[PDB]
Structures are given as C-alpha cells and as structure tokens.
C-alpha cells in the first residue's frame, strides 16, 4: 500500500493508501509519515488527506480536499522559491509543470459548468 | 491576502490559505484548505493544516512535516487510478505526465545536492 515514489535516495517521508478503491477506481485517503521517530518512539510526522468522495452538497458524501487543492499549494511554494534567493532553473521547470497539470485539470470542470447551465 | 489565487475560478469547492509568515526562501510553512460552505452552526464541512518541514529533520528544533514531492507523490498516485479506471481521458493524461515532470525535476535538485 505504501507509494514507489521518483525520488529513491534520502527519503524524508513515505505515502501510503489508506482504504479501499472507491469512485473511478481512486483511493480517497492518504498518510504522510516520517521515516524518523522521535526518543519515545512514535513518528516525527503523521499526517493523514482525506479526499472529497462525492458531491459536496451530498451529505451523505466524505468530504475533503481534491486534487487541484494539493498542486495550488505546491505552486504557492514554488512561486515564492521563485521569487526569492534561492531561486533555480530545477524548480522554475518544475513550477510550469505543476501550473499546466492544473490548467488540464481545469478543463474537464469548465466543459462541466458550460454543459450544466444548458 | 493570505487567500490563494488559483487556476481553477468557479465552483471551487475549498479556500487554500497561506497560515504564519514567509521563511527560509521566502516561502511559507503552513497552509490550511478549508471549504466553502458550512452546517448551521457555522462549522466548516473541511478544514486540514498542511505543514511543511522547515529546518533539517536531524534538528530537534526544526518544524517536522511534509515537503512538496509528498503532495505531488499523492495527485500522481490518484491520476494513475483515474487513468486505470473508467474516467480515463486525455486531460489527466496530460496532467499526469506533467506531474510525474515536475517529480523529476525537483528530484534532480535533490540528487545534485546527495553528489555535493
């Protein structure tokens, strides 16, 4: 269950599915978790993402965050990584990636909303 | 405005929001997504913190969290599914090869600083 990652070496954190396949075959949860423990022995991080399962204005549906939420706060990141000393070609090739998998995202909910109001 | 200008401009369904101040580099360490509406008693239906490593992992004093690899690790692992499954399209096609992209590049800066 746990993630295989591009990044190989010196590893931070690992990622792991939480659950089961749920709509369009997508796990809707998610833990970050640190390979380090602390002196009592418990994780340094443990950090769980749940994802928005179903329409929002469905009670009976998991709400949570999706996946534009997670790229916008890494673009954040870059950008100020960007616009500050410690600026690089490596995350300025990184930052358009992550800005046109968001611009791609967005298509299929605008064609959405224009089919919605016809 | 601590506030996200994001790609996506109608119907979103969560506010993404910078929390604390800008540090090393100028970039914050802390972000909240919270959603858009609410029960009657003015409770949000989302609210998660997401916080960032800041300082080495060695350093007792460094805040311990997440870094921006494990965010795109997670989109990436959701639109391999997707594109598995039968909301498969050309759109997350594309959004997965620039996700995997950005992975690559920001794991090049990581193997260049392992050599030095």
Redesign the interface.
């Known amino acids: 269950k746990e ?1 295989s ?3 190989k ?2 590893k ?2 690992t ?1 792991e ?1 939480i659950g089961s ?1 749920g ?5 809707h949860e ?1 833990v ?1 978790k ?1 390979n ?1 423990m602390d002196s009592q022995g418990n994780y ?2 443990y ?1 769980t ?4 399962k179903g329409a ?1 204005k469905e009670e009976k549906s998991q ?12 673009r ?3 950008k ?2 960007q ?4 600026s ?1 070609r ?2 300025a ?3 358009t ?14 064609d959405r ?1 224009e089919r919605n109001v016809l």
Not at 49 to 52: A, E, V
Not at 97 to 110: D, G, I, K, S, T
Request: charged share 25%; glycine share 6%; hydrophobic share 40%.
């Open positions: 993630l990652t591009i990044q070496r010196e931070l954190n990622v599915r396949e709509p369009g075959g997508a796990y998610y970050i640190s380090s340094d991080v950090e993402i749940k994802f928005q929002r709400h949570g965050v999706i996946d534009s939420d997670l790229l916008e706060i890494v954040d990141r870059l100020s990584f616009a500050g000393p410690f690089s490596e995350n090739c990184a930052l990636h992550v800005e046109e998998a968001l611009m791609w995202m967005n298509r299929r909910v605008e909303i």
